[PDB]
Amino acid sequence: XYXXXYX
Amino acid sequence: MQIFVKTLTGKTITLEVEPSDTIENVKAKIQDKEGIPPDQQRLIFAGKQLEDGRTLSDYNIQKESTLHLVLRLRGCKXX
Ligand SMILES: *[C@@H]1O[C@H](CO)[C@@H](O)[C@H](O)[C@H]1NC(=O)CCCCCCC(C)C
Ligand SMILES: *[C@@H]1O[C@H](CO)[C@@H](O)[C@H](O)[C@H]1NC(C)=O
Ligand SMILES: *[C@H]1O[C@H](CO)[C@@H](O)[C@H](O)[C@@H]1O
C-alpha cells in the first residue's frame, strides 16, 4: 500500500 | 419531474429535479433542504449505487420515483 483509492 | 428520497430515518423528502440535473446536483439539493453534506450521501435506487457524475436520464429514472438515502460506505478496496 502507500497511496489511497478507493477503487 | 419530481422524485422522492426515502431515508433510514424513514422520512420521505420531496425533491424537485430535472432530467438534466446530475446525481450530485440532487444530493446537493438535499443540502439545501436539510443541510446534509453531499459528500456524506449515497443514493441507492433499483438496487444500484448511483454514481455522482451522471444524470437521471442515464438511469432512466422516471417521474415520481423513490431513491434511498443511505450513508457512504467506506470502501475496503485500496490502500
Ligand atoms: C486508509 O483507509 C482505510 C479504509 O479504506 C483504513 O482502514 C486505513 O486505516 C486508512 N489508512 C490511513 O492512513 C488513512 C489516512 C491517514 C492520514 C494520511 C495523511 C497523508 C499521509 C498526508
Ligand atoms: C471507495 O471506493 C468505492 C468504490 O466502490 C466507493 O464505493 C466508496 O464510496 C469509496 N470510499 C470512500 C470514498 O471513502
Ligand atoms: C488500484 O489498482 C489500480 C489498477 O490500475 C491502480 O492504478 C491504483 O493505483 C491502485 O493500485
From Swiss-Prot, chain B:
The membrane topology term of the UniProt record is: Peripheral membrane protein
The record lists the effect of T9D as:
Impairs ubiquitination by CRL2(KLHDC3) E3 ligase complex
The cross-link described as Glycyl lysine isopeptide (Lys-Gly) (interchain with G-Cter in ubiquitin) comes at K6, K11, K27, K29, K33, K48, K63
The Ubiquitin-like domain is annotated at 1-75
Post-translational modification remark = Phosphorylated at Ser-65 by PINK1 during mitophagy. Phosphorylated ubiquitin specifically binds and activates parkin (PRKN), triggering mitophagy. Phosphorylation does not affect E1-mediated E2 charging of ubiquitin but affects discharging of E2 enzymes to form polyubiquitin chains. It also affects deubiquitination by deubiquitinase enzymes such as USP30. Mono-ADP-ribosylated at the C-terminus by PARP9, a component of the PPAR9-DTX3L complex. ADP-ribosylation requires processing by E1 and E2 enzymes and prevents ubiquitin conjugation to substrates such as histones.
* Phenotype upon changing R74K: No effect on ADP-ribosylation
Q: Where is this site: Interacts with activating enzyme?
A: R54, R72
Domain of life assignment: Eukaryota
Kindly provide the name given to this protein in its UniProt entry.
Ubiquitin
The organism is Homo sapiens (Human)
In the UniProt record, what gene is named as encoding this protein? UBC
